[PDB]
Design an enzyme around this catalytic site. Structure first.
Site, mmCIF file in Angstrom:
data_model
loop_
_atom_site.group_PDB
_atom_site.id
_atom_site.type_symbol
_atom_site.label_atom_id
_atom_site.label_comp_id
_atom_site.label_asym_id
_atom_site.label_seq_id
_atom_site.Cartn_x
_atom_site.Cartn_y
_atom_site.Cartn_z
ATOM 1 C CB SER A 103 -9.024 -0.440 -0.607
ATOM 2 O OG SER A 103 -8.117 -0.488 -1.694
ATOM 3 C CG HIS A 108 -5.553 3.922 -0.235
ATOM 4 N ND1 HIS A 108 -5.024 2.639 -0.451
ATOM 5 C CD2 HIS A 108 -6.837 3.931 -0.648
ATOM 6 C CE1 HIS A 108 -6.015 1.922 -0.952
ATOM 7 N NE2 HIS A 108 -7.119 2.659 -1.100
ATOM 8 C CG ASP A 151 -2.164 0.914 0.909
ATOM 9 O OD1 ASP A 151 -2.859 0.745 -0.107
ATOM 10 O OD2 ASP A 151 -2.398 1.810 1.731
#
Lengths: 92, 281, 99
Positions: free
Chosen positions: B221, B61, B21
């Site tokens: 996600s 994120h 990630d």
């Protein structure tokens, strides 16, 4: 004989970087030998190459930065299972 | 009152979760002391890029997802300890090669670390990749539990990687009304490659704006991060579970025939599992 | 971080093929608004474009006269169509004028 693979979605393709994957029933030192062999053969033809990474334990092979013109040459290398052109991945 | 997504997965020991990630804010109150930022970095960008982007630290994120898995107040497994690998850049982009080198790093770390349960969260997707599916298969064969996003393409998860890998738990997204998630003109992927669904719309979790901030995010996600949290809880109680034994328990304890299959294309309704993840009671 | 979506979407002007939407711009924008539009009651496939929040406005062109349209705005960090989104969406209904 080995096969060439690439991303079906054309904008995600990254030509110029390839994952050269070797057959599982090979020696650990065979990944480095084939990388060195690909480099020598390419240099004879006037092509510069960079070995970015040598794969151990996960799958046998290596990551090479070279011209796509050398794929025909690279697919003829002994112990090569397949060669994959790098592509993009994205946060979901 | 609990957030909807944590209510949904609630029915009526030294587990490490690897995240691949973006960069994360490791000093956020949600995950502080339980997240370690590893030295692994393989991204398509120059090293100094994330220092000269006045806008952000490129960690929004990653931080949110670390919060969804292990966050103290809003996470699935408040326990868990996590290990961060940077494979997605400032644009949210990575490479198949960089993800491979990351999985290779995890294999090397598994061989060094004492025999224990290992969860790998891949909240990313690209096109079907023969090599990425092969690397995932090999890691699964080594006893590693891999959890990936089904993809946000409103398409068949078979055309995407790691989504299309059978040895990986592929997670789609559902909302508070048990509907598949709409993202723009797209949304959650479907088909036979999806293993199950999990909450993936209006998910509250750690915001990298400040160490006590929270933000709502939506995507597959977030859905995958719920399942990585559920798997980490399951392995904390039963550390010797096979991937086949864990997958068996996920399917078994999930909520069934609760998703409105009308959002999916007609030919895909029978092929898509009508399961929403839940914890064992 | 990623700018919240507007509290209300204002339809300023409407021609038989165009729609003009406005919103108070945020003080320090980051990153984009994904503006999605389609015919209310899925006769046609949904369309989209991304716009920086700071623009305060967007024009939806090439519409059919007299049909009811739904406009949905999503706060997003990345502009690619398959990204996730932040916060909640905001929707508005608008009937375009006849020729």
């Amino acid at each position: 004989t080995a096969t060439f693979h690439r991303c079906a979605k054309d904008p995600w393709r990254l030509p110029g970087t390839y994952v050269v994957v070797l057959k599982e029933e090979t020696h650990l030192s065979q990944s480095e030998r084939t990388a060195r062999r690909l480099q020598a053969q390419a240099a004879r033809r006037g092509y510069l190459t960079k070995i970015l990474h040598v794969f151990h334990g996960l799958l046998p092979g290596f990551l090479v930065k070279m011209s796509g013109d050398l794929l025909e040459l690279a697919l003829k290398l002994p112990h090569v299972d397949y060669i994959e052109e790098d592509s993009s991945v994205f946060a979901q | 009152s609990i957030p909807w997504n944590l209510e949904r997965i609630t029915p009526p020991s030294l587990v490490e979760v690897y995240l691949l990630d973006t960069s994360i804010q490791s000093d956020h109150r949600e995950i502080e002391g339980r997240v370690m930022v590893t030295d692994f970095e393989n991204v398509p960008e120059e090293d100094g890029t994330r220092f000269h982007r006045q806008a952000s630290k490129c960690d929004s994120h990653g931080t949110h997802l670390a919060g969804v898995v292990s966050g103290r107040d809003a996470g699935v497994a408040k326990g868990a300890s996590m290990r961060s690998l940077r494979v997605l850049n400032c644009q949210g982009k990575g490479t198949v090669s960089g993800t491979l080198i990351g999985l290779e790093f995890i294999r090397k770390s598994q061989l060094v670390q004492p025999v224990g349960p290992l969860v790998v969260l891949l909240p990313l997707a690209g096109g079907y990749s023969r090599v990425l599916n092969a690397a995932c298969q090999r890691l699964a064969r080594a006893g590693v539990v891999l959890v990936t996003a089904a993809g946000n393409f409103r398409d068949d998860a078979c055309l995407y990687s790691p989504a299309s890998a059978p040895e990986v738990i592929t997670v789609g997204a559902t909302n508070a009304q048990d509907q598949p998630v709409t993202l723009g003109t797209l949304g959650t992927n479907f088909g036979r490659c999806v293993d199950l669904f999990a909450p993936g719309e209006d998910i509250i979790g750690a915001s990298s704006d400040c160490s006590t901030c929270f933000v709502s995010q939506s995507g597959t996600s977030q859905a995958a991060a719920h399942v990585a949290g559920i798997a980490a809880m399951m392995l904390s109680a039963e550390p010797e579970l096979t991937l086949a034994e864990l997958r068996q328990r996920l399917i078994h304890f999930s909520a069934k025939d609760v998703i409105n299959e009308a959002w999916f294309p007609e030919d895909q309704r029978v092929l898509t599992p009508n399961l929403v993840a839940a914890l064992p009671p | 971080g990623v700018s919240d979506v507007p509290r209300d979407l204002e339809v300023v002007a409407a021609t038989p093929t165009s729609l003009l939407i406005s919103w108070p711009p945020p003080s320090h924008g980051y990153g984009y608004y994904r503006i999605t539009y389609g015919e209310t009651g899925g006769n046609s496939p949904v369309q989209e474009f991304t716009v920086p929040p700071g623009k305060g406005t967007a024009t939806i062109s090439g519409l059919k006269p007299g049909v009811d349209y739904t406009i949905t705005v999503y706060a997003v960090e990345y502009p690619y169509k398959h990204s996730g989104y932040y916060h909640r969406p905001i929707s508005i209904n608008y009937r375009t004028e006849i020729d």
